[PDB]
Design a protein around this ligand. Structure first.
Ligand code: ADN
Length: 251
């Protein structure tokens, strides 16, 4: 491709590294989104290596609930990412507007996500980023994950013990990362949010989390079944999809 192959639109967002204005291939008159990343930035931080990788990975990653990555090119100074356009914005935002999601929307979201993760695990790719910020919304309020470069302990809030503890972790993490989310969904905030980075592992690794006077108990267990110190003690994919909670409020 070529930067001339498309018509640029307003800036969808911002980025320390690069930008990403609305786009449109001039042929298809088709709407897009071009995540252009700078050089100097992909260079000011050994990440040229961190690129190509995900690049080649999403660059195949064909799933509804996985923001597709049509193509990529790159000129002297910069590089460009040609990707699926997600109109309804970020769940984070959606999540900061309605305070907390209901049960249909949050359970359903979780099952959407799960499968996106299934097709992932199958094709052996353990994501690791997922949280409101790296999850987008399509035409039908459908979900889309987008794990790439870009620009409140939120940093840790999401990580699983096995990692913040520097230990070894594998596939079993996407389940933990899947617990939190479902929680922050039904609540408004993560389950391990606390003032200091310190006062957090304390709650994360120690797995110190409480429920508000209302969350269904069917959650209270689907979740307690999604967050556990022991990575091998957690439900594999199926289970949630097959959990008494997903099914029912969902889809
Ligand atoms: N494909 C996309 N669909 C919708 N919004 C997007 C897309 N890519 C990036 N954005 C927006 O651009 C911002 C910067 O990446 C994000 O916070 C998000 O709002």
């Amino acid at each position: 491709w070529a930067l001339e192959d498309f018509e640029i639109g307003r800036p969808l967002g911002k980025g320390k590294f690069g930008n990403v204005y609305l786009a449109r291939e001039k042929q298809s008159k088709f709407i897009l989104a071009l995540k252009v990343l700078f050089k100097a930035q992909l260079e000011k931080a050994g990440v040229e290596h961190q690129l190509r990788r995900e690049v080649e990975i999403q660059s195949h990653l064909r799933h509804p609930n996985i923001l597709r990555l049509y193509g990529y090119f790159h000129d002297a100074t910069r590089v460009y990412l040609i990707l699926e356009y997600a109109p309804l914005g970020t769940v984070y935002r959606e999540l900061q507007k309605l305070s907390k999601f209901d049960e249909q929307r949050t359970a359903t979201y979780i099952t959407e996500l799960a499968n996106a993760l299934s097709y992932c695990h199958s094709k052996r790719v353990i994501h690791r980023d997922i949280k409101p910020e790296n999850l987008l919304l399509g035409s039908a309020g459908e979900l889309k994950i987008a794990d790439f470069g870009w620009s409140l302990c939120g940093t840790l809030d999401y990580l699983p013990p096995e990692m913040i503890e520097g230990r070894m972790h594998d596939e079993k993490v996407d389940l933990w990362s899947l617990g939190v989310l479902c929680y922050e969904f039904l609540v408004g905030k993560p389950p391990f949010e606390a003032n200091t980075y310190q006062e957090t592992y304390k709650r994360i690794s120690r797995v110190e989390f409480t429920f508000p006077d209302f969350v269904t108990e069917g959650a209270r267990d689907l979740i307690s079944r999604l967050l556990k110190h022991n990575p091998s003690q957690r439900p594999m994919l199926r289970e949630v999809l097959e959990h008494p909670w997903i099914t029912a409020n969902s889809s």
